[PDB]
Amino acid sequence: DLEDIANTTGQWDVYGSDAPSPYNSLQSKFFETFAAPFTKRGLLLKFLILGGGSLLTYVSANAPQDVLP
Amino acid sequence: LVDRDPIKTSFEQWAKPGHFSRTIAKGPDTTTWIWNLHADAHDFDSHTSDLEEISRKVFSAHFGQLSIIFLWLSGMYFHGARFSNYEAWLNDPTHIGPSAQVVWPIVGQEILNGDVGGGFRGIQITSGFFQIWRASGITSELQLYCTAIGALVFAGLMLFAGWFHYHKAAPKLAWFQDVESMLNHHLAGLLGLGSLSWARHQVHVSLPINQFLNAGVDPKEIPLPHEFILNRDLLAQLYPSFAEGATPFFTLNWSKYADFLTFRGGLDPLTGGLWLTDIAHHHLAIAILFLIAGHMYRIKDILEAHKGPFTGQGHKGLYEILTTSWHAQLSINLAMLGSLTIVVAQHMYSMPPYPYLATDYATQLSLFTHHMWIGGFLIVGAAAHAAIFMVRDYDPTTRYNDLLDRVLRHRDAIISHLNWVCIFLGFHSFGLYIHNDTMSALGRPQDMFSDTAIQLQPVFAQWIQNTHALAPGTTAPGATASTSLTWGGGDLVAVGNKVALLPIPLGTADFLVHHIHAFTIHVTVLILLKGVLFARSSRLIPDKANLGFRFPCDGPGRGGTCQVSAWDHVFLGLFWMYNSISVVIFHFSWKMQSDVWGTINDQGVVTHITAGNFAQSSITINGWLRDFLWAQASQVIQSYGSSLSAYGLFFLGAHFVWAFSLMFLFSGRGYWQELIESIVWAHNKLKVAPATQPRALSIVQGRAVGVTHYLLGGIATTWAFFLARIIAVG
Amino acid sequence: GDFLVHHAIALGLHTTTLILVKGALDARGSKLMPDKKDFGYSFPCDGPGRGGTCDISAWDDFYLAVFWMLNTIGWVTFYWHWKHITLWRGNVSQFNESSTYLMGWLRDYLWLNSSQLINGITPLVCNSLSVWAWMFLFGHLVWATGFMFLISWRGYWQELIETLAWAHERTPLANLIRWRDKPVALSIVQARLVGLVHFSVGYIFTYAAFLIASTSGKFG
Amino acid sequence: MSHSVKIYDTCIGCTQCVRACPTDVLEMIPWGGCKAKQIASAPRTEDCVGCKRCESACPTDFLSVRVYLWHETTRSMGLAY
Amino acid sequence: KPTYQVIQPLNGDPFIGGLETPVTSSPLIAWYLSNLPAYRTAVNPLLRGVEVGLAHGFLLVGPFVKAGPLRNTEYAGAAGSLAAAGLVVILSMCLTMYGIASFKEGEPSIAPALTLTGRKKQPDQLQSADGWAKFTGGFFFGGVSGVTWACFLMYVLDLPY
Amino acid sequence: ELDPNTPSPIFAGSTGGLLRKAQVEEFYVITWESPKEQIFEMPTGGAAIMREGPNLLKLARKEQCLALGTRLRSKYKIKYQFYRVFPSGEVQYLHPKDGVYPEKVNPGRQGVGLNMRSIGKNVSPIEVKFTGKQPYDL
Ligand code: CLA
Ligand code: CLA
Ligand SMILES: CC(=CC=C/C(C)=C/C=C/C=C(C)/C=C/C=C(C)/C=C/C1=C(C)CCCC1(C)C)/C=C/C1=C(C)CCCC1(C)C
Ligand SMILES: CC(=CC=C/C(C)=C/C=C/C=C(C)\C=C\C=C(C)\C=C\C1=C(C)CCCC1(C)C)/C=C/C1=C(C)CCCC1(C)C
Ligand SMILES: CC1=C(C/C=C(\C)CCC[C@H](C)CCC[C@@H](C)CCCC(C)C)C(=O)c2ccccc2C1=O
Ligand SMILES: CC1=C(C/C=C(\C)CCC[C@H](C)CCC[C@@H](C)CCCC(C)C)C(=O)c2ccccc2C1=O
Ligand SMILES: OC[C@H]1O[C@](CO)(O[C@H]2O[C@H](CO)[C@@H](O)[C@H](O)[C@H]2O)[C@@H](O)[C@@H]1O
Ligand code: SF4
Ligand code: SF4
């Protein structure tokens, strides 16, 4: 019995659900609160929908000398 | 049933109410069963629970088609004969504008009968006899008058073979339930021994009798009724009596020849119907195969064989029940027969096979849309009848765990995909056009999708067209031109009345129709696919094979529970395909006339029925009634008081009949009941109604009288719209 | 010419009302549905069997009515204009021997007198009107797209949404992600409405843009 | 109502008459005299969908039921999923 | 080793669908997708936020800077931001008011690790509102921002051909 | 699942039955007897075999799992049996309860059949205006 090869390394096998990469690059808390105000999210969104959306549309429509429709 | 089985009467069943399931048509009177009786008249869940007969009927009540196709054709050969114009037209083509039919001047009639060629009053033709008929290695009016009764011969006889079945005490099982040989035979010698036999009567006789027609004469100043025997002396002009060769092989010398054939490709200058010097060789080169081919074979073996991992274990065993189905081995067929008809519809217009077509515009597009509605009306069918399988046919479930039991395994799946396919199309496949409007009506062309604004630049060319007309320089031998003159490379000179085919250019406005087809071909099929697949069971109804493949709708519950079934998937799948074909047609002529059809004169300055208006202007989908529907059709709505007039004069009805379908399509049912009684009341007062309980339409009958009308309406509408814009300029 | 339209506005409010009169004259019930009530109006549908029973709620006859109120109120309006049109910047003989028939009602009017508008997106730049013609095809779509709603009938829709809501649940980068309303197909009265309330704008938004888009040009 | 369609009749005998209809109808509840003595119109109906398979067979001689329930769960339409 | 895993429809029981074929569960793919919110919730939703915001970020440029409404721009405010620093914004609260279909109101902090997780019944929800914030907050700073090293990158471009 | 593998009703794959909404809400499942190894038809489109165990297949929703009868009693057997599983336990004991075979007599349970007044002349429409004091909540 040669091709009975005792499964040339069993593996263990099933690797896992276990463990075929560490995790996520150490880049993190290099944003800690950095950009907060959706990381102070404690009551907001009403603020960013008058603000952001009055300045994607206030100046965004107006213009000092057309370049018309 | 009953009177009076079984042994004990000859005495036939004329008289005693009913027959067709068993608290049958009941003594008690009603109307529904009079659409019953005709509908489902052919069917099989009744007649007997036992195969046997049915195949013993279908091989008979088949027959009476051939015989019919045979009573038909006769009145067409007769017709294409003594109601002449064929004699007249042939000495005089490029000139004539053919007829076969003519009225009789009763009532209004005559307007319909309007000078057509060799000097007579009649109604034209877009059905290219007068052009198969080129053939006649002979010519003569009374002659077709033999071919004609030769027709009624095959008929009466190929119609007493149908007495000489079912009614005669029939074959049985083995006879078909041994399949073992069937195609062995069919393809070998008929498929073969026709194409073969057709060879022998396609150079013998025809070739020569238009080899020296393509010049002048007046017939019988040519081609006698026997002349073409042993006399292998006129076969002298159109190659050797083999001179010193004996039964091909090689110890042959050519210092100057190579038998008839000497392969063409292109188009006769004087009769651009493609060359005949070929037409023998290709039919010969067919038959051989069939001649060799129909010599398999005896059956499983070959399908009981190649399986795999995910592949089809049941591939192996792909149906004992493919000798025990029909409804199965019909539905398969229709997809092919059907899908193998509209492949005609191309090789025709971009490769005419009859003398005088193209020049003859209207007498081969009629064709390319008639052939086009079968390669579609036969395909939705080719699905219906699979649904008819998928529901019932076999006795029990003996068929098991295979290719199918597989496909079904996934099923909320194969149709899960296909769906998104369509909304990806549709958004890329129609709103595409709508951009244009919204932004060309906004108006800024900079940014449309024009054959010129969105980046594409004065060329389409580099693809495969341009490596087709140019391929006679491969393994290719050759023979001046191509294969189909409509290809990119070289040549022009085609015809001396009007035009025929030339390149046919592309890019966008060819790019995107070609894509609407995709999305149109696809969502058609979605509804038939999921329709036939979910035939018998589901998670809206599982108790759902319990009557038949029709059934109206299960019931108000589950939310909707109406359409479901698969009569109906083969009811809303017609509904699409009517488009599928109805817009493909819309495509061809707007091309084929916007470019191609048009015309030569000095310096052959080409002058299309329309200077390519297509250009920048089908891309707008209004252009499709600016340039189409409102442009052409001005010949339909001018057509009164003429000769054709029967088109404009249809085009109102049938453009009415459609706008009557919606009433059948769009409405309830205990409605026309609730109404049919008010009626039934007023009826009784005078004493005039009850007997034969008058009743409204059978939920799904109602849908039957939608659809069928919506089509014979919405369709002949254009059948008119058309013949009225090729007769008369074009 | 007027001794016909005038009999075909008369075949409208009559037919329109045999159905409304009827619609009404038993939201109560009848033979097929005897006890048709406690809810009368919009109970659209009923089970199959008995004879086969359907749009037999007094709503679905109202539903059914609104097609002839949309076919009278068209023959009638249609009529004025052709008349007026001709009776302005030109003739009247026109409506005379050319409204005594039918084809012609389509040809000269319908087919004559649209001219102006449609060659207004024209392959040769946006000319006079553009709102109108795009409306007029917006007119032909909203219409047509009635039909689904109308030849579709909740059954077929719901079921492939049964397969089409096996997606998400079975596909990554779009799992967990919960709806809060369970994917279904439209109610069995609802779509008789929506095809309509759809059939209608299309239709009423097409003459809207049709007449204007041609009483404006003229010639009249 | 929330499943209220009346199929009642007068025989409420159920032999070569009617059975069909997913779960809903556990009857045979013999009322003190009605021929083949089994009667009424339903059992506990808070279980299944909205058929009229309910008649289609065995009399209701009047109406026959259909959808009328409005208040409509999901379990009460296939699709809560 | 076998014919294809120990041959199976799903993880196990064949009465759930999924019909685990390839394109479903080949170690060839199922690993190209689980540092992220496929099988397991790494760190919280906090950080995944911006690799999601950003990656999806510098997309939507040539889509609306090379297919822009009047296209191939000679405006120094396009070949980048221009407007589309609108999409991320029209959809960076297309999200927040979907995390209102999440409430469940807590504060544990378990992005640090303890005993080889499972998050167990990790299916269904088990990510409250104070999670879906720190993601769709990672989204804005991933969207707006991921729009500028698009823009900011000059453009050295490969062309037609 | 596997570490506990307790099966009975053979199948292999299928994109048919059970999916997300049979955890997050209710469950539904049918059970049965049988003689010797026989190949069946199936709800959800597919088809497999039998022999025994519990013979306990689990099913998406209960209209689905009685159709083993609407054919799975045209294939012998008294006994077929479907219950109701939750994500936690009971109330709704589905084919459990008392007797079985819808068309016998032990008790009467529910049903009624009448409303207030019977099928008779309800040309009488809707009566009172709905008002919290006169027996129209039934
Ligand atoms: C090889 C093919 C062919 C054959 C032999 C059959 C055979 C059969 N089909 Mg079938 N079918 C086919 C092609 C075929 N089909 C195609 C292409 C389709 C797609 C449309 C269908 C769609 C179809 C359906 C939906 C059904 C069948 C059914 C059947 C069975 C019923 C036959 C019957 O009673 O006649 C039916 C014919 C009539 C009752 C005559 C009415 C024809 C009207 C609509 C006229 C058509 C319009 C025309 C312009 C009118 C004449 C002109 C007028 C203006 C003067 C039978 C076994 C039925 C079944 O229940 O299975 C057992 C089922 O109804 N077929
Ligand atoms: C003009 C048509 C109208 C429209 C728009 C549709 C559209 C559709 N039908 Mg349909 N149908 C119709 C009439 C219509 N039908 C009628 C009259 C009938 C029978 C009489 C049917 C019978 C039918 C069947 C049996 C089927 C369909 C299916 C479909 C879908 C196919 C996939 C697809 O490409 O959709 C998406 C694409 C479009 C709808 C076209 C583009 C729409 C444009 C205008 C873009 C608009 C988007 C834009 C963002 C607007 C937002 C702006 C804001 C102001 C709102 C699609 C939803 C099938 C299906 O669902 O398969 C996938 C199914 O097979 N239909
Ligand atoms: C009997 C015979 C034959 C033949 C031949 C044949 C047997 C031929 C045939 C052929 C066939 C064909 C050629 C076909 C045709 C078809 C058609 C034409 C159709 C068409 C169409 C289409 C396309 C589709 C549908 C419609 C229609 C119909 C139109 C013979 C026999 C023999 C013998 C034994 C003895 C010696 C001699 C011989 C000779 C050896
Ligand atoms: C009013 C009417 C009619 C109408 C009509 C209309 C208003 C319409 C109709 C239509 C019909 C139709 C229409 C049929 C047909 C047909 C055909 C023949 C077709 C063919 C085709 C084909 C082949 C396929 C598809 C395409 C087409 C369609 C072409 C009538 C009335 C009356 C009166 C007074 C009383 C007595 C009776 C009468 C005398 C009757
Ligand atoms: C209008 C309409 C009706 C009413 C249509 C009817 C009643 C048509 C049937 C009329 C028959 C054909 C008249 C037959 C009478 C003559 C054959 C008798 C005299 C014999 C001749 C000599 C005249 C339905 O029944 C229906 C059913 C389901 C969905 C939609 C609809 C639908 O839209
Ligand atoms: C398509 C279709 C569906 C499917 C349901 C669909 C497609 C709903 C799809 C949603 C569309 C895309 C919403 C777009 C509508 C917008 C104008 C927004 C509506 C805003 C409202 C509040 C007014 C049915 O359920 C149905 C039921 C009965 C008869 C016919 C049909 C039918 O034709
Ligand atoms: O009216 C639109 C017009 O104004 C813009 C908008 O940014 O900005 C002007 O404002 C600055 C501020 O100093 C001025 O210097 C100069 O006019 C513009 O930068 C400009 O885009 C628009 O052209
Ligand atoms: S009428 Fe129907 S179910 Fe009612 S009592 Fe009879 S069969 Fe029973
Ligand atoms: S009629 Fe109603 S109660 Fe009866 S089975 Fe159908 S749904 Fe259930």
Phi, psi for residue B293 in degrees, rounded to 5: 145, -55
Q: Does B547 touch chain D (CB under 8 A)?
A: no
Beta strands across the sheet bearing F80-83: F56-58, F29-32, F80-83
Task: Examine residue F101 and say whether the peptide bond preceding it is cis (omega within 30 degrees of 0).
Answer: no
Amino acid of residue B452 = T
Closest CA to F64 of F13, F24, F14, F18: F18
Judged by CB atoms within 8 Å, which residues 19-38 of D form the interface with B? Answer: 22
Query: What CA–CA distance (Å, rounded) separates B586 from B574?
Result: 18
Q: Ligand 2 centroid to B517 CA: how many Å?
A: 15
Q: Are C5 and C72 in contact (CB under 8 A)?
A: no
CATH number for the domain that contains residue D49: 3.30.70.20
CATH number for the domain that contains residue A48: 1.20.5.220
Q: Do chains E and D touch (3 or more CB pairs under 8 A)?
A: no
Q: Cα B601 from chain centroid?
A: 36
The binding-site residues of ligand 8, defined as CB within 6 angstroms of any ligand atom, are: D 7-9, 11-14, 17-18, 58-60
Q: Ligand 2 centroid to E98 CA: how many Å?
A: 27
Q: Ligand 2 centroid to B415 CA: how many Å?
A: 17
Residue B97 in tokens: 């504008």
Cβ-based contacts of E21 with chain B (< 8 Å): 310
Give, as one character, the DSSP assignment of residue B624: I
Surface-to-core class of residue C93, CB atoms within 10 Å of its CB (0-12 exposed, 13-18 middle, 19+ buried):
exposed
* Euclidean distance between the first and the last CA atom of chain E, given in angstroms as a whole number: 47
Longest Cα–Cα distance of chain A, Å, equals 90
Residues in CB range of B36: below 8 A, 6 or more apart = B20, B25, B698
* Closest Cβ–Cβ partner in D6, D51, D62 for C47: D51
List residues forming the annotated binding site of C.
45, 54, 140, 148, 156-157
Query: What CA–CA distance (Å, rounded) separates B112 from B491?
Result: 41
Could you tell me the residue ranges of all domains in chain B? 1-730
Q: Please tell me which residue of chain F has the smallest CA distance to C38.
A: F126
Cβ-based contacts of C180 with chain E (< 8 Å): 101
Residue ID of nearest Cα to ligand 4 atom 13: B654
Residue B711 in tokens: 């089509």
Residues in CB range of E29: below 8 A, 6 or more apart = E22, E23
The whole domain housing A52 covers 40-62
CA B120, B125, B129, B132 torsion: positive or negative? positive
Query: What CA–CA distance (Å, rounded) separates B484 from B501?
Result: 9
Phi, psi for residue B390 in degrees, rounded to 5: -40, -40
Give exposure, B516-538, as e/b (b: 16+ Cβ within 10 Å). Answer: bbbbbebbbbbbbbbbbbbbbbb
Phi, psi for residue D41 in degrees, rounded to 5: -150, -25
Query: What CA–CA distance (Å, rounded) separates B212 from B216?
Result: 8
* Closest Cβ–Cβ partner in B410, B446, B447 for E19: B410
Q: Are F65 and F122 in contact (CB under 8 A)?
A: no
Count of domains in chain D?
A: 1
* Closest Cβ–Cβ partner in E11, E13, E124 for F24: E124
Query: What CA–CA distance (Å, rounded) separates B212 from C213?
Result: 61
Query: What CA–CA distance (Å, rounded) separates B650 from A1?
Result: 87
Q: What is the topology classification, in CATH, of domain B1-730?
A: Photosystem I p700 chlorophyll A apoprotein A1 (1.20.1130)
Q: Ligand 7 centroid to A60 CA: how many Å?
A: 11
Residues in CB range of C15: below 8 A, 6 or more apart = C68
The whole domain housing F116 covers 1-138
The atom of ligand 4 lying closest to the CA of B713 is: 13
Q: Which chains touch B (3 or more CB pairs under 8 A)?
A: C, D, E, F
Q: Are B688 and B713 in contact (CB under 8 A)?
A: no
Strands F56-58 and F29-32: antiparallel
Query: What CA–CA distance (Å, rounded) separates B688 from B685?
Result: 8
Q: Are D56 and C52 in contact (CB under 8 A)?
A: no
Q: Are E102 and E129 in contact (CB under 8 A)?
A: yes
Residue F98 in tokens: 């008392």
Closest CA to E51 of A23, A41, A51, A18: A23
Contact F20 C169 (CB under 8 A): yes
- Chain C interface mutation, best of F20, F25, F64, F128, highest count of C Cβ atoms under 10 Å: F20
The atom of ligand 3 lying closest to the CA of B198 is: 13
Query: What CA–CA distance (Å, rounded) separates B170 from B52?
Result: 10
Element (H, E) at B216: none
> Does D34 carry a binding-site annotation?
no
Ligand having the closest approach to the CA of D34: 8
Q: Does F13 touch chain E (CB under 8 A)?
A: yes
Ligand having the closest approach to the CA of E77: 7
Q: Please tell me which residue of chain C has the smallest CA distance to F127.
A: C38
Ligand 5 contacts CB of residue B371 (under 6 A): no
Residues in CB range of B19: below 8 A, 6 or more apart = B1, B25
Query: What CA–CA distance (Å, rounded) separates D37 from D54?
Result: 20
Query: What CA–CA distance (Å, rounded) separates B409 from B423?
Result: 25
Closest approach of F112 to chain E, Cα-based (Å): 39
Cβ-based contacts of C32 with chain B (< 8 Å): 670, 673-674
Give exposure, D48-79, as e/b (b: 16+ Cβ within 10 Å). Answer: bbbbbbbbbebbbebbbbbbbbeebebbbbbb
Contact B540 C162 (CB under 8 A): yes
CA distances from B292 to A1, B284, C100 (A): 52, 12, 69
Q: Ligand 7 centroid to A55 CA: how many Å?
A: 14
Contact C172 E123 (CB under 8 A): no
CA contacts within 13 A on the Cβ side of B627: 27
CA B73, B79, B85, B90 torsion: positive or negative? positive
> Does D54 carry a binding-site annotation?
yes
CATH number for the domain that contains residue E67: 1.20.1240.10
Angle at alpha carbon of residue B167, lines to B161 and B169, rounded to 5°: 100
Ligand having the closest approach to the CA of B377: 1
CA contacts within 13 A on the Cβ side of B409: 23
Query: What CA–CA distance (Å, rounded) separates B363 from E12?
Result: 64
* Closest Cβ–Cβ partner in F15, F122, F126 for C35: F122
Helices (H) and strands (E) in chain A, counts: 0, 0
Query: What CA–CA distance (Å, rounded) separates F40 from F36?
Result: 12
Contact B437 C30 (CB under 8 A): no
Give, as one character, the DSSP assignment of residue B101: B
Query: What CA–CA distance (Å, rounded) separates C189 from B560?
Result: 10
Ligand having the closest approach to the CA of C193: 6
Q: How many residues belong to chain C? A: 220
CA distances from C197 to B198, B389, C142, C190 (A): 62, 40, 10, 10
The whole domain housing D26 covers 1-81
Q: How many CB atoms lie within 10 A of CB B54?
A: 16
Residue B122 in tokens: 């009649």
- Chain B interface mutation, best of F64, F65, F74, highest count of B Cβ atoms under 10 Å: F64
CA contacts within 13 A on the Cβ side of C149: 22
Residue ID of nearest Cα to ligand 4 atom 12: B654
CA contacts within 13 A on the Cβ side of C93: 0
- Phi-psi region at B509: left, alpha or beta (left = phi > 0; alpha = psi -120 to 50): left
Q: Ligand 2 centroid to A19 CA: how many Å?
A: 48
Q: Ligand 2 centroid to E62 CA: how many Å?
A: 29
Contact B556 D67 (CB under 8 A): yes
- Identify the residue whose tokens are 């042959």: B252
Give exposure, C157-183, as e/b (b: 16+ Cβ within 10 Å). Answer: bbbbbbbbbbeebbeeeeeeeeeeeee
Q: Do chains E and C touch (3 or more CB pairs under 8 A)?
A: yes
CA distances from B577 to B584, C59, F102 (A): 10, 33, 47
Ligand 7 contacts CB of residue A58 (under 6 A): no
DSSP string for E32-65: TT-SSSSSS--S-HHHHHHHHHHHTTSSSSGGGT
The binding-site residues of ligand 1, defined as CB within 6 angstroms of any ligand atom, are: B 38-43, 330, 334, 377-378, 380-381, 384, 388, 567, 570, 708, 712
Angle at alpha carbon of residue B42, lines to B37 and B43, rounded to 5°: 105
CA C192, C197, C198, C203 torsion: positive or negative? positive
Query: What CA–CA distance (Å, rounded) separates B281 from B477?
Result: 15
DSSP string for B319-354: -GGGSS-SHHHHHHHHHHHHHTTTTHHHHTTTS--S
Contact B413 E69 (CB under 8 A): no
Query: What CA–CA distance (Å, rounded) separates D8 from D42?
Result: 8
Residue B56 in tokens: 């013993």
Q: Are B131 and B356 in contact (CB under 8 A)?
A: yes
Q: What determination technique applies here? A: X-ray
Q: Are F58 and F16 in contact (CB under 8 A)?
A: no
Q: Does F126 touch chain C (CB under 8 A)?
A: yes
Query: What CA–CA distance (Å, rounded) separates B618 from B632?
Result: 14
Residue B47 in tokens: 């007649």
Helix B381-391 to helix B327-339 angle, to the nearest 10 degrees?
160
List residues forming the annotated binding site of C for [4Fe-4S] cluster.
45, 54
Residue ID of nearest Cα to ligand 9 atom 3: D24
